[PDB]
Amino acid sequence: PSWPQILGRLTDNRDLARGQAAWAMDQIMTGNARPAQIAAFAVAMTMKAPTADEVGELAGVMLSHAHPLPADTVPDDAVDVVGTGGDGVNTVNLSTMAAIVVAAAGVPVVKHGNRASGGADTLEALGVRIDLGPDLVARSLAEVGIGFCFAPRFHPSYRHAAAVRREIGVPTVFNLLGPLTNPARPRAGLIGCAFADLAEVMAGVFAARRSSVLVVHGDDGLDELTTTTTSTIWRVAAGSVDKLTFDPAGFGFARAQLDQLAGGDAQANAAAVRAVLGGARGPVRDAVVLNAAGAIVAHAGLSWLPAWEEGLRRASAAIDTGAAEQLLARWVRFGRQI
Ligand SMILES: O=P(O)(O)OC[C@H]1O[C@H](OP(=O)(O)OP(=O)(O)O)[C@H](O)[C@@H]1O
Ligand SMILES: Cc1cc(C)c(N)c(C(=O)O)c1
Ligand SMILES: [Mg+2]
Ligand SMILES: [Mg+2]
């Protein structure tokens, strides 16, 4: 295998041969790939139109190189709530807030995340330790019900890819990898995809791993279940993908305006988390509850309408009883206690 060969095949608009994407990603992750080669590969893959097999190869290499969590520390039914980002709309950290609420409802959550105010920035501002290694994330999950895997901490060898991603700016296939590379390897997730054309490829990757996952794209372009309009959902169950249209109004949700979901810096976004967890009613709470419920449905799938009703009931109660607010406080506390 070589760069001229792989790049030539991609510029010929041809799907890669089995193992070629893995070879490329492994060259990238081991510091053996020049910045020019990384960029060429990222772009060529993107323009060819990556397949699930290919994206699955890239993600597997990343996971091979990632720091794992200690054996037997991650529950068999752990769930992630994470999006590709890059939806061009600046929202409150819907996934992060949903994760807190899901953990509070009793579903173990191991959230993969990163800076932008991104999930990681907002958590840091809330006083949550984002920087914890495998052992301590495992303890966090055991003692709090939620662990946060900070992408840079667990994927240090991604450094060269990350630099190139910054330099070129343009979204590429690499933008799909975060939600597919949680180092704790949870089997369930609510997975946001900004890129409508690539949501199905993401779903295909999760299906190949037999995850129970909802890949979601708001029909307003949010990488979350949206409240402003309907959402497209790629439902992954039993190793196959269903595409459907999801309408929140179907559960009594009032239509919001995207401006009402808008975020700010880490301090603003942190305030918005505190507000939701303190019971503030309105658009942000509604979107958080909806996404929390979707994550619970994905968790349920590890065994539709009944699932959503129970998910919504459970998410609402976790906030209303103060369990969500208390969980965050316990999370802050856990991290201050080293
Ligand atoms: O949108 P960008 O800033 O360009 O970067 C992509 C973001 O995707 C993640 O959202 P995640 O679902 O993990 O958290 P959230 O929905 O709570 O923000 C995380 O915040 C990354 O920064
Ligand atoms: C996954 C990951 C890993 C490393 C080492 C990074 N620096 C970044 C980043 O800057 O976004 C992301
Ligand atoms: Mg998100
Ligand atoms: Mg988002």
Curated annotation (Swiss-Prot):
Residue positions binding Mg(2+) 2: 223-224
Gene: trpD
Annotated positions binding Mg(2+) 1: 95, 224
UniProt name for this protein: Anthranilate phosphoribosyltransferase
Binding site residues for 5-phospho-alpha-D-ribose 1-diphosphate: 83, 86-87, 91, 93-96, 111-116, 119
Superkingdom of this protein's organism: Bacteria
Gene Ontology annotations for the cellular component aspect, listed alphabetically: cytosol
SUPFAM superfamilies associated with the record: Nucleoside phosphorylase/phosphoribosyltransferase catalytic domain, Nucleoside phosphorylase/phosphoribosyltransferase N-terminal domain
Cofactor binding annotation: Binds 2 magnesium ions per monomer.
Cofactor: Mg(2+)
Annotated positions binding anthranilate 2: 165
Span of the signal peptide: none
Gene Ontology BP annotations: L-tryptophan biosynthetic process
Pathways per UniProt: Amino-acid biosynthesis; L-tryptophan biosynthesis; L-tryptophan from chorismate: step 2/5
Record bears the keyword RNA-binding: no
